[PDB]
Design a protein around this ligand. Structure first.
Ligand code: CA
Ligand code: CA
Ligand code: CA
Ligand code: CA
Lengths: 133, 18
């Protein structure tokens, strides 16, 4: 697992860890999954935790998350709100804030720049995939 | 601020949430 990967997984971990206590509870999984338009059942949430909870304590810590970590089009659809096939800074800034993240336009712009391959100022589907593959 | 890290982490999160 590369250094950047552990750091990306750390970032993801932080997005679920609402209280910032080093643990992801079922409540946190549900809350986040509902903010993105999902509707998990208590049983499905219990099973997610169960399927990767090594020490059987009922919550996932960063190390367990790591093991777990160690579909694109659907994720693309969450970012591309207006459905035009392109993610713009404003759409990106929306998702980020939705994830509780508070960031500067400059930062949202740098993020767009990181994924933008052809340099049109937005992220299309192929560029979104490449960034994930 | 690491642009690629913050973006991929949020994409991973939505990818898992989905
Ligand atoms: Ca927590
Ligand atoms: Ca545990
Ligand atoms: Ca769009
Ligand atoms: Ca582009």
């Amino acid at each position: 697992l590369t250094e950047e990967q552990i750091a990306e997984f750390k970032e993801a971990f932080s997005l679920f860890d609402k209280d910032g206590d080093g643990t992801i509870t079922t409540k946190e999984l549900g809350t986040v999954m509902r903010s993105l338009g999902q509707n998990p059942t208590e049983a499905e949430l219990q099973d997610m935790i169960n399927e990767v909870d090594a020490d059987g304590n009922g919550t996932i810590d960063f190390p367990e998350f790591l093991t777990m970590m160690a579909e694109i089009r659907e994720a693309f659809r969450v970012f591309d709100k207006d459905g035009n096939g392109y993610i713009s800074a404003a759409e990106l800034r929306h998702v980020m804030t939705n994830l509780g993240e508070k960031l500067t336009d400059e930062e949202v712009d740098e993020m767009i720049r990181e994924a933008d391959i052809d340099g049109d100022g937005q992220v299309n589907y192929e560029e979104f995939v490449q960034m994930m593959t | 601020f690491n642009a690629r890290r913050k973006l991929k982490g949020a994409i991973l999160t939505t990818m898992l949430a989905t």
